[PDB]
Scaffold this motif. Structure first.
Motif, PDB file in Angstrom:
ATOM      1  N   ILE A 269       0.857  -1.179   0.000  1.00 52.94           N
ATOM      2  CA  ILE A 269       0.000   0.000   0.000  1.00 52.94           C
ATOM      3  C   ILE A 269       0.896   1.232   0.000  1.00 52.94           C
ATOM      4  O   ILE A 269       1.824   1.330   0.811  1.00 52.94           O
ATOM      5  CB  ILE A 269      -0.968  -0.003   1.202  1.00 52.94           C
ATOM      6  N   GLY A 270       0.642   2.139  -0.929  1.00 51.47           N
ATOM      7  CA  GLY A 270       1.399   3.373  -1.025  1.00 51.47           C
ATOM      8  C   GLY A 270       1.755   3.685  -2.463  1.00 51.47           C
ATOM      9  O   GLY A 270       1.402   2.962  -3.391  1.00 51.47           O
ATOM     10  N   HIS A 271       2.481   4.789  -2.622  1.00 52.39           N
ATOM     11  CA  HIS A 271       2.837   5.330  -3.926  1.00 52.39           C
ATOM     12  C   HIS A 271       4.219   4.853  -4.341  1.00 52.39           C
ATOM     13  O   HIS A 271       5.122   4.748  -3.505  1.00 52.39           O
ATOM     14  CB  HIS A 271       2.822   6.857  -3.905  1.00 52.39           C
ATOM     15  N   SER A 272       4.377   4.586  -5.634  1.00 48.83           N
ATOM     16  CA  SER A 272       5.675   4.332  -6.242  1.00 48.83           C
ATOM     17  C   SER A 272       6.091   5.583  -7.002  1.00 48.83           C
ATOM     18  O   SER A 272       5.409   5.993  -7.948  1.00 48.83           O
ATOM     19  CB  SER A 272       5.621   3.127  -7.177  1.00 48.83           C
ATOM     20  N   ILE A 273       7.201   6.192  -6.581  1.00 52.10           N
ATOM     21  CA  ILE A 273       7.653   7.431  -7.207  1.00 52.10           C
ATOM     22  C   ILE A 273       7.997   7.189  -8.669  1.00 52.10           C
ATOM     23  O   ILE A 273       7.808   8.066  -9.522  1.00 52.10           O
ATOM     24  CB  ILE A 273       8.851   8.016  -6.436  1.00 52.10           C
ATOM     25  N   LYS A 274       8.508   5.998  -8.983  1.00 49.90           N
ATOM     26  CA  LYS A 274       8.823   5.669 -10.367  1.00 49.90           C
ATOM     27  C   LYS A 274       7.563   5.635 -11.219  1.00 49.90           C
ATOM     28  O   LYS A 274       7.567   6.091 -12.368  1.00 49.90           O
ATOM     29  CB  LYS A 274       9.548   4.328 -10.427  1.00 49.90           C
TER      30      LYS A 274
ATOM     31  N   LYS B 121       1.662   8.578 -17.560  1.00 49.14           N
ATOM     32  CA  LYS B 121       1.371   9.222 -18.836  1.00 49.14           C
ATOM     33  C   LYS B 121      -0.124   9.328 -19.114  1.00 49.14           C
ATOM     34  O   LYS B 121      -0.519   9.427 -20.282  1.00 49.14           O
ATOM     35  CB  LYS B 121       2.064   8.461 -19.975  1.00 49.14           C
ATOM     36  N   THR B 122      -0.967   9.321 -18.082  1.00 48.95           N
ATOM     37  CA  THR B 122      -2.409   9.357 -18.278  1.00 48.95           C
ATOM     38  C   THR B 122      -3.100  10.042 -17.111  1.00 48.95           C
ATOM     39  O   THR B 122      -2.752   9.820 -15.948  1.00 48.95           O
ATOM     40  CB  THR B 122      -2.994   7.949 -18.437  1.00 48.95           C
TER      41      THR B 122
ATOM     42  N   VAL C 231      -1.784  12.365 -21.299  1.00 49.16           N
ATOM     43  CA  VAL C 231      -0.983  13.498 -20.853  1.00 49.16           C
ATOM     44  C   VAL C 231       0.484  13.131 -21.008  1.00 49.16           C
ATOM     45  O   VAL C 231       0.860  11.958 -20.936  1.00 49.16           O
ATOM     46  CB  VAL C 231      -1.287  13.906 -19.390  1.00 49.16           C
ATOM     47  N   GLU C 232       1.317  14.150 -21.225  1.00 45.57           N
ATOM     48  CA  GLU C 232       2.756  13.924 -21.286  1.00 45.57           C
ATOM     49  C   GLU C 232       3.309  13.530 -19.922  1.00 45.57           C
ATOM     50  O   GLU C 232       4.375  12.910 -19.836  1.00 45.57           O
ATOM     51  CB  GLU C 232       3.459  15.178 -21.809  1.00 45.57           C
ATOM     52  N   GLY C 233       2.610  13.889 -18.848  1.00 48.05           N
ATOM     53  CA  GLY C 233       3.031  13.541 -17.515  1.00 48.05           C
ATOM     54  C   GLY C 233       2.420  14.461 -16.479  1.00 48.05           C
ATOM     55  O   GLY C 233       1.440  15.164 -16.744  1.00 48.05           O
TER      56      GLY C 233
END
Ligand code: CLA
Ligand code: CLA
Ligand code: CLA
Ligand code: CLA
Ligand code: CLA
Ligand code: CLA
Ligand code: CLA
Ligand code: CLA
Ligand code: ECH
Ligand code: PQN
Ligand code: PQN
Ligand code: SF4
Lengths: 148, 39, 33, 137, 148, 60, 739, 80
Positions: free
Chosen positions: G295-300, G306-307, G313-315
């Motif tokens: 559980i949590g965010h992956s910075i990579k 891209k969405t 979206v470009e990012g």
């Protein structure tokens, strides 16, 4: 620059001054050269800090330009340190990026710009370094005695 | 020649750039309105 | 307790430099390290 | 702000006006100077502090001199640009930068009375990717 | 009496001569790179100087280091001692003193010269060497410059 | 390219990157960088010429 | 010879160059021979522990000497009129007059007066006895001992961490925010509530009795039951006297917001309330990430996204961030160049607040300590900011791969590299031409005897910010000054408890809180903007030009620090990216002088009760030479005089010391190598030809200093003299006059 | 000591080999059928890093480069 001070401080201290009819001489600085001119702080205290009071306080008087000339030389002096300390390699790269801005707006010069030569950079500095030095003590010598 | 020195991929109006700029511009006008005592 | 400063000041100014510089000089001038 | 008041109410401005220090050869230049600076706001020193806020009341402080520069400044740059581009068409361009061709320059110097009209007309100011790009990034 | 003129007149020429002396060394080098012919300068005074240039500079390097220590270091020692609160350890007139006896020696001869050597002279050549205080109005024109 | 044509460079590590110039000569040989080009703008050395390969050049 | 084991090249050098360059790149583990990435991170990790130990041991030194050689007891009884002493001094060189001069602040022997401000910090936080300081020193000695053991421990093979463990970014960030920052902030609220605040009201609370005594009469049940208001029930009174029961309130957490009247410092009750709120948000910020539990965010994934919800979206912000995660974690110089910038800003963020919002008792009135602290951190703030760009330049050289990025924001930055450098030149030029000419117009026009013609313009919109916080002196009647405005009284919820205390401090004018700005403050503020722009231009240019430029396209090959390329193409003198750091640090020091002279002269007028001399004479530059520099230096130069010696003799000696050191650097900057090596050859000839000195001979051949070495030696001289010189002026001018 | 690298853009000016004071460079025949010659760097121990060759090469960017490296008595030009 030490020769002119050795002349300036001594004569004010030991020779130049006012004499009474009785025969007692009152020199300008009162023999401070004997005990103060043997330490670097004494020159900083009794010769530079003390005798320069007339220069900084010259504003609003006839000697006010000496206060300006005493000061504008300090700018010209430190301006010398640009060319002595630096090197052409930095300056041509900076000019290259600036040339792009003129190419963009179509203000590109025909005579392609170039940084100053290496020997010239050393030359332009010592020209400023000396001009800023001599012009500084030039006004300090003037305003001090013109008041005293 | 791996990387193009110049950028690509944008149209004349530049909608995304202008939208955020006008917002940053509007808040500047807002703080001025408080300074001039308009609000 | 003030006598400690009389023993610690000079060794810092004399003994420690002499020991460090003497070791470092022989260390850098060594042929094999 | 910062204890800023008008001139006449400020006692400092009233005292400095007496010590004239006439600048120009006119004897009454000092009195005419202080009278003209009565319009501005004066602090505890009595020296006028100009407000460059953009107030239309204080437009003469910054706003009016500001426009007077940019009209002059664009005159100088727009003249130099047109003279430079005009030289580029001729054969020996480098020499004309030093030894100016007055036949080309003086007509261009005559223009520039309306540089913004010409400037907005040139939506193509020569900018492209065909310029000096200078290793890859 | 015009103390303003004397310093400015003294300081001006002192600087002019320094600039010109440096120019003399510059053109001395320009002569070498450009006009020096080894055929003409064969075992002469100049060629013999170039062939031992290392000994000339190495010894001059020693003198510059010798003096700079024992000329500026004495100021540092006095500056250090006066800050330490030891005014008796300085190089001063009351403390350890370094009298210019040779200059005091030469000074005394010029005061006693008008009598014995070059006897036709009435007064000493300059009152700076010695004699009596000369007073023009209230200002002193010149007086003996004591050396300590 | 044709001799005498005005051409632009794309070779990086060049003084005249994205700059136009006339082709003075072209060597009909297998040497790499055969085309010879001349310019008005000098480099720092002051040469006004260098040889380039055909792939590194786009005609203007 | 093998002195540098890290370099076979330098070791195989007959000259003395090996000794100097070995000192330089002995800490550069990336350049060490036979250094892999795994051994690299491991060696770096152990070095942090040793550096951490030097901190705490240095912290122990402050406590030991103040305990053994400090009058901390006597200073507590009268903090204002007693001078804190840092440590004793045992110089055999001191003569008897000097020992009498330094027997100051009621010391049996000679001693130095302290100016760091630790006495105010240790006193405010709860220490009231010298023996308590002895425990802090001994605790830090053992606390440092743990790290030194840990540093050696993690170099053994069983304990050497793996490279993947070092590259774990989410875990390290997750733990630091919550545990390093948050729990430390939470813990700090504990000492303030259990030790500092009780001791401030007279209740002694030490290790012996902290379990028995309660911080609040009510237990810990009001927190669990929801009765939060009980802790803020009754506050301390205005007539409260610090470290005593008079005027004591029982509350432990409050939000008064103003300064204590007596101490002119912020409420201890608010600081405890502060760190508790900080620890909550920081702990909350920790759990965001994906560490191991799924559980949590992956910075990579967040960077390479891209969405939007459904749209392309470009990012993030429609900007590409493909290889930013790999560029950050893989490159060490990128992190270092980045972190020093964040730390450099925070260092300035400290200094801006310490004089404005003094958080220690009786520190604002101690004028010398307040000035040294501001000057200290601002100097430090800039080295970190200047060092940030140096590693940012190094990263582009060696740790940057264009193919890995291939179209991100970073590749997009450098593509318009010329516009960044170009427009920066406009901004710096646009400031200095106009800023100087106003100083110069005001200089001349005052010199001719017409000061009224000076170009004086008020810092108007900056007053509007001061008025927007409640300052009524300007009379703008803006948001927080106007009672009718919504900010003065929040219409939905009338909960602006900060406003009563805050409005008092600004509108008082006694303390230094949003001090009165004037026309003299205007120009100097723009001068500062030039130092920050031009210093950025130099650093940004060399960094962005580090990989290559026109005069040297293949600059990436040589590296960060190389002297030149030769006299070819009429130049190459200072072309490296190292020389950009070199020429920037001159500005970065000068930019402080404009800041610190501004701080010192403005405050000296406030402390001395003469606000006019700044606001009047700061427009024309001659006031800076005469009123500020010339006058204040009178007691300094008179530290040692022909008549005697005072207590300021050290600073005078230090004042002249930095002058000599500042000028000694001009040699290495101006006179370059080729003159010197020729001079060295003559001395070599003499020693080899002097008969008795032929016996002794060098083992390493003596050569002149290199081109880059002389630059290093020259700037270090320029900086040391810049530092020691202003220090002696800053301390002696403030201390001799005591404001 | 140093490393003098010669790249493909040579044209056989023979200016580099002349400008070298220590004779580090040499012009050798190239296997190119229509290429007349090309430079070489056979005795690199004697390079003294004076960069005269880099000033002599007339290419747009230099076919020859001198990368500084480990120093010695010969490279540092120490007669002593
Ligand atoms: C000849 C001049 C002279 C000399 C030799 C000294 C000598 C000394 N003074 Mg001193 N002093 C002098 C003049 C002098 N004074 C003058 C004129 C004044 C003004 C009145 C003072 C005022 C004064 C005060 C106020 C104090 C001293 C102190 C001291 C002592 C410091 C010893 C110490 O802590 O270790 C040496 C100190 C160091 C900081 C180490 C060197 C620092 C370098 C730059 C960095 C270190 C790393 C190095 C570069 C790497 C190589 C080293 C290697 C081991 C790793 C020492 C005995 C102190 C004292 O009483 O002793 C505690 C003290 O507090 N002095
Ligand atoms: C805080 C974090 C930090 C870290 C980890 C590093 C780490 C590193 N830096 Mg770095 N740097 C930092 C901050 C940091 N720096 C800051 C704040 C600046 C701005 C000044 C710089 C500027 C900088 C430059 C310009 C360079 C580095 C380089 C390097 C690398 C080699 C270090 C080296 O040469 O040995 C250290 C060697 C030394 C000789 C340091 C000590 C010298 C000091 C200045 C002597 C001062 C004299 C004396 C003590 C004072 C006397 C006092 C007097 C009163 C008596 C290394 C990876 C170099 C490199 O090649 O990177 C790959 C490089 O070129 N850094
Ligand atoms: C104040 C700045 C300063 C100082 C001190 C020096 C010092 C020196 N320069 Mg110099 N120089 C400078 C600025 C300075 N330079 C600048 C700005 C330029 C550019 C124009 C030059 C250009 C230049 C050239 C071109 C030449 C010199 C030369 C010299 C040397 C002359 C020999 C001498 O005086 O004996 C040495 C005297 C001193 C160093 C004075 C102070 C020494 C004190 C008294 C002793 C120190 C006390 C103690 C031992 C300290 C121990 C501490 C311990 C803890 C380690 C000397 C090393 C010449 C040279 O090297 O040939 C000899 C030379 O040819 N310089
Ligand atoms: C370079 C200039 C210089 C000179 C001449 C002196 C001189 C002196 N200092 Mg001093 N000092 C200096 C710089 C100098 N200082 C500096 C820069 C500092 C600051 C660090 C100090 C700080 C200082 C302190 C703190 C103290 C002194 C003291 C002293 C005195 C005692 C010297 C002593 O014990 O040494 C002994 C000297 C020697 C053993 C050797 C001297 C060299 C001999 C004479 C060489 C002769 C060579 C020969 C002619 C060649 C022969 C040729 C062959 C063919 C026959 C003396 C008057 C002390 C004092 O109290 O003063 C009264 C003292 O306590 N100094
Ligand atoms: C250092 C030695 C020295 C110097 C420089 C002079 C210099 C001078 N002497 Mg003199 N003199 C000297 C020693 C010296 N004297 C001695 C030892 C004697 C023996 C008593 C004399 C006896 C002497 C006489 C008798 C006269 C001079 C005169 C002069 C002056 C003009 C001489 C011509 O030629 C001149 C100023 C002449 C004069 O009138 O002086 C103004 C003159 O008539 N000298
Ligand atoms: C909760 C768990 C935890 C904790 C407490 C730490 C703690 C630490 N780790 Mg760490 N680490 C952890 C988990 C943890 N780690 C994990 C899980 C990993 C693997 C993913 C790592 C991997 C790791 C590496 C690879 C490194 C560390 C390092 C460090 C040290 C950082 C230096 C330091 O002390 O900064 C102290 C920092 C602060 C106090 C906060 C920043 C400063 C702010 C601005 C202060 C607040 C402002 C305030 C006003 C200050 C006032 C001061 C006061 C005196 C007035 C520190 C001891 C580094 C180190 O030093 O090596 C040993 C290092 O190289 N750790
Ligand atoms: C700032 C606004 C914001 C937004 C738009 C989201 C949005 C999202 N979060 Mg989230 N989150 C936020 C703040 C936010 N969060 C904060 C402040 C925290 C710290 C308490 C977290 C902690 C958090 C965790 C721990 C997780 C999310 C997850 C998610 C996603 C489900 C979703 C895209 C989940 C996720 O990764 O889904 C992909 C997930 O596991 N968030
Ligand atoms: C007082 C000394 C001084 C001064 C005035 C400057 C001024 C400048 N430096 Mg600089 N510099 C200095 C010291 C100084 N530096 C030192 C010691 C170093 C360390 C080596 C550097 C390192 C350095 C670098 C590395 C860079 C600069 C840059 C700049 C420029 C920044 C643009 C700007 O702010 O425009 C303001 C300009 C001024 C205030 C001066 C303009 C001249 C006057 C006001 C008008 C001239 C008219 C004249 C009086 C009449 C003609 C008279 C007749 C005799 C000919 C500017 C020209 C940067 C640059 O050029 O990039 C844009 C840059 O990259 N400098
Ligand atoms: C476990 C646990 C709990 C029990 C907690 C109890 C019962 C005690 C815990 C106490 C704690 C957590 C003590 C903290 C100790 C660390 C201390 C005391 C010191 C830190 C000092 C530092 C870092 C350095 C300070 C410095 C020094 C030394 C100085 O002298 C000057 C200042 C400075 C330079 C800063 C409770 C029941 C709650 C919940 C269940 C789990
Ligand atoms: C600043 C600097 C430069 C760059 C300096 C330059 C480019 C000076 C340029 C001066 C004038 C202002 C250029 C433009 C002259 C125009 C003809 C003026 C316009 C005409 C009107 C004024 C009438 C170097 O080239 C350099 C080289 C080696 C060591 C140090 C340095 C160095 O410090
Ligand atoms: C003086 C000078 C020299 C000659 C300087 C030399 C040879 C240094 C001699 C100094 C000796 C080694 C004493 C220095 C001792 C220091 C006080 C302590 C240094 C030790 C630290 C490592 C601890 C150069 O070689 C040079 C090269 C390029 C540009 C400028 C210059 C330059 O100005
Ligand atoms: S740094 Fe020295 S060798 Fe390099 S270009 Fe400048 S003067 Fe020439």
């Amino acid at each position: 620059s030490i020769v002119i001070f050795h002349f300036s401080w001594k004569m004010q201290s030991d020779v130049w001054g006012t004499v009474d009819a009785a025969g007692n001489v009152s020199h300008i600085t009162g023999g401070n050269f004997a005990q103060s001119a043997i330490t670097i702080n004494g020159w900083l205290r009794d010769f530079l800090w003390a005798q320069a009071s007339q220069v900084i306080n010259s504003y609003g008087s006839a000697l006010s330009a000496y206060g300006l000339m005493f000061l504008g030389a300090h700018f010209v002096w430190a301006f010398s340190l640009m060319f002595l300390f630096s090197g052409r390699g930095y300056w041509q790269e900076l000019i290259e990026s600036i040339v792009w801005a003129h190419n963009k707006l179509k203000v590109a010069p025909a005579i392609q710009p170039r940084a100053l030569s290496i020997t010239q950079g050393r030359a332009v500095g010592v020209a400023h370094y000396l001009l800023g030095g001599i012009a500084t003590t030039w006004a300090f010598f003037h305003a001090h005695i013109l008041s005293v | 020649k791996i990387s193009p020195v110049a950028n690509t991929g944008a149209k004349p109006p530049y909608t995304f750039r202008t939208g955020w700029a006008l917002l940053l511009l509007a808040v500047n006008f807002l703080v001025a309105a408080y300074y001039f005592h308009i609000i | 307790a003030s006598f400690l400063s009389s023993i610690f000041v000079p060794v810092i100014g004399w003994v420690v430099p002499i020991a460090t510089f003497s070791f470092l000089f022989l260390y850098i001038e060594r042929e094999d390290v | 702000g910062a204890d800023l008041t008008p001139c006449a109410e400020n006692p400092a401005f009233q005292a400095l006006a007496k010590n004239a220090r006439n600048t120009t050869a006119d004897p009454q230049s000092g009195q005419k100077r202080f009278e003209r600076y009565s319009q501005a706001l004066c602090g505890p020193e009595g020296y006028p502090h100009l407000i460059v806020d953009g107030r239309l009341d204080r437009a003469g402080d910054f706003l009016i001199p500001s426009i007077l520069f940019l009209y002059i400044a664009g005159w100088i740059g727009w003249v130099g640009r047109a003279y430079l581009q005009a030289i580029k068409k001729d054969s020996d361009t480098e020499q004309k930068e030093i030894q100016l061709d007055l036949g080309i320059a003086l007509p261009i110097i005559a223009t520039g009375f309306a540089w913004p009209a010409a400037a907005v007309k040139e939506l193509l100011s020569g900018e492209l990717t065909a310029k000096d790009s200078e290793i890859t990034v | 009496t015009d103390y303003a003129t004397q310093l400015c007149i003294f300081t001006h020429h002192i600087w002019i001569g320094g600039f010109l002396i440096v120019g003399g060394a510059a053109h001395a080098a320009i002569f070498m790179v450009r006009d020096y012919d080894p055929v003409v300068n064969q075992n002469n005074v100049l060629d013999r100087v170039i062939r031992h240039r290392d000994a000339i500079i190495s010894h001059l390097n020693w003198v510059c280091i010798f003096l700079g220590f024992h000329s500026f270091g004495l100021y540092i020692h006095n500056d250090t001692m006066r800050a330490l609160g030891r005014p008796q350890d300085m190089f001063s007139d009351t403390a350890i003193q370094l009298q210019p006896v040779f200059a005091q020696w030469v000074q005394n001869l010029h005061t006693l010269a008008p009598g014995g050597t070059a006897p036709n002279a009435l007064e000493p050549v300059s009152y700076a060497f010695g004699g009596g205080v000369l007073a023009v109005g209230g200002k002193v024109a010149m007086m003996p410059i004591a050396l300590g | 390219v044709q001799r005498g044509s005005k051409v632009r460079i794309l070779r990086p590590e060049s003084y005249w990157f994205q700059d136009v110039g006339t082709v003075a000569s072209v060597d009909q040989s297998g040497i790499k960088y055969p085309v010879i080009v001349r310019f008005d703008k000098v480099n720092y050395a002051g040469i006004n010429t260098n040889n380039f390969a055909v792939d590194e050049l786009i005609e203007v | 010879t093998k002195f540098p084991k890290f370099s076979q090249d330098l070791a195989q050098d007959p000259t003395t160059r090996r000794i100097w360059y070995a000192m330089a790149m002995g800490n550069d583990f990336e350049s060490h021979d036979g250094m892999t990435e795994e051994n690299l991170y491991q060696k770096i990790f152990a070095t942090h522990f040793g550096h951490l130990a030097i901190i705490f041991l240095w912290a122990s030194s402050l406590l030991f000497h103040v305990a053994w050689q400090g009058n901390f007891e006597q200073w507590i009884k009268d903090p204002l009129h007693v001078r804190p002493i840092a440590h004793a001094i045992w110089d055999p060189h001191f003569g008897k007059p000097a020992i009498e001069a330094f027997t100051q602040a009621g010391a049996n022997g000679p001693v130095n007066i302290a100016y760091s401000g630790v006495y105010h910090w240790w006193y405010t936080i709860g220490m009231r006895t010298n023996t308590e300081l002895y425990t802090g020193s001994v605790f830090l000695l053992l606390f440092a001992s743990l790290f030194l053991f840990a540093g050696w421990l993690h170099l053994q093979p069983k304990f050497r961490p793996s490279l993947a463990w070092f590259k774990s970014a989410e875990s390290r960030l997750n733990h630091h925010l919550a545990g390093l920052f948050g729990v430390s902030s939470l813990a700090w609220a504990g000492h303030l509530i259990h030790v500092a605040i009780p001791e401030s009201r007279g209740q002694h609370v030490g290790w012996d009795n902290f379990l028995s005594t309660a911080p609040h009469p009510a237990g810990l049940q009001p927190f669990f039951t929801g009765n939060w208001g009980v802790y803020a029930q009754n506050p301390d009174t205005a007539g409260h006297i610090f470290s005593t029961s008079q005027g004591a309130g029982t509350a432990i957490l409050t939000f008064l917001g103003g300064f204590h009247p007596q101490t002119e410092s912020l409420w201890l009750t608010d600081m405890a309330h502060h760190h508790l709120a900080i620890a909550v948000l920081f702990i909350v910020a920790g759990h965001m990430y994906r560490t191991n539990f799924g559980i949590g965010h992956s910075i990579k994934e967040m960077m390479n996204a891209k969405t939007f919800f459904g749209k392309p979206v470009e990012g993030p912000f429609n900007m590409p961030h493909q290889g930013i995660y790999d560029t950050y974690n893989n490159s060490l110089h990128f992190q270092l160049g980045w972190h020093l910038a964040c730390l450099g800003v925070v260092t300035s963020w400290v200094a801006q607040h310490m004089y404005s919002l003094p958080s220690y008792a009786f520190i604002a009135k101690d004028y010398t300590t307040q000035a040294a602290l501001y000057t200290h951190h601002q100097y430090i703030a800039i080295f970190l900011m200047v060092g940030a760009f140096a590693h940012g330049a190094i990263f582009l050289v060696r740790d940057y791969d264009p193919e890995q990025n291939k179209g991100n924001v970073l590749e997009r930055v450098l593509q318009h590299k010329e516009a960044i450098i170009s427009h920066l030149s406009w901004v710096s030029l646009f400031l200095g031409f106009h800023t100087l000419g106003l100083y110069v117009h005001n200089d001349v026009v005052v010199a001719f005897g017409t000061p009224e013609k000076q170009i004086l313009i008020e810092p108007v919109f900056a007053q509007f910010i001061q008025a927007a916080h409640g300052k009524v002196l300007y009379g703008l009647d803006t948001l927080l000054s106007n009672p009718d405005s919504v900010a003065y009284t929040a219409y939905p919820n009338y909960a602006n408890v900060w406003l009563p205390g805050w409005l008092d401090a600004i509108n008082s004018g006694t303390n230094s809180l949003f001090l009165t700005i004037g026309p003299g403050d205007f120009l100097v503020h723009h001068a500062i903007a030039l130092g920050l722009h031009t210093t950025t231009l130099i650093l940004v240019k060399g960094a962005l030009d580090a990989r290559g430029s026109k005069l040297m396209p293949d600059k990436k090959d040589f590296g960060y620090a190389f002297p030149c390329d030769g006299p070819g193409r009429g130049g190459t003198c200072d072309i490296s990216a190292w020389d950009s750091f070199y020429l920037s640090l001159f500005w970065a020091l000068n930019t402080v002088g404009w800041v610190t002279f501004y701080w010192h002269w403005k405050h000296l007028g406030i402390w001395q009760g003469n606000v006019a001399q700044f606001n009047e004479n700061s427009t024309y530059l001659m006031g800076w030479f005469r009123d500020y520099l010339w006058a204040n230096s009178a007691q300094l130069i008179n530290g040692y005089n022909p008549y005697g010696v005072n207590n300021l003799s050290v600073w005078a000696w230090m004042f002249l010391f930095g002058h000599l050191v500042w000028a000694t650097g001009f040699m290495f900057l101006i006179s370059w190598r080729g003159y010197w090596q020729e001079l060295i050859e003559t001395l070599v000839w003499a020693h080899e030809r002097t008969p008795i000195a032929n016996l002794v001979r060098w083992k390493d051949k003596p050569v002149a200093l290199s081109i880059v070495q002389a630059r290093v030696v020259g700037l270090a001289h320029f900086t040391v003299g810049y530092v020691l010189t202003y220090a002696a002026f800053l301390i002696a001018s403030t201390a001799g006059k005591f404001g | 000591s140093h490393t003098v690298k010669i790249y493909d853009t040579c044209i056989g000016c023979t200016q580099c080999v002349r400008a070298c004071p220590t004779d580090v460079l040499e012009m050798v025949p190239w296997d190119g059928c229509k290429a007349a010659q090309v430079a070489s760097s056979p005795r690199t121990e004697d390079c003294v890093g004076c960069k005269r060759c880099e000033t002599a090469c007339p290419t747009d960017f230099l076919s020859i480069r001198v990368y500084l490296g480990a120093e010695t008595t010969r490279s540092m030009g120490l007669a002593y």
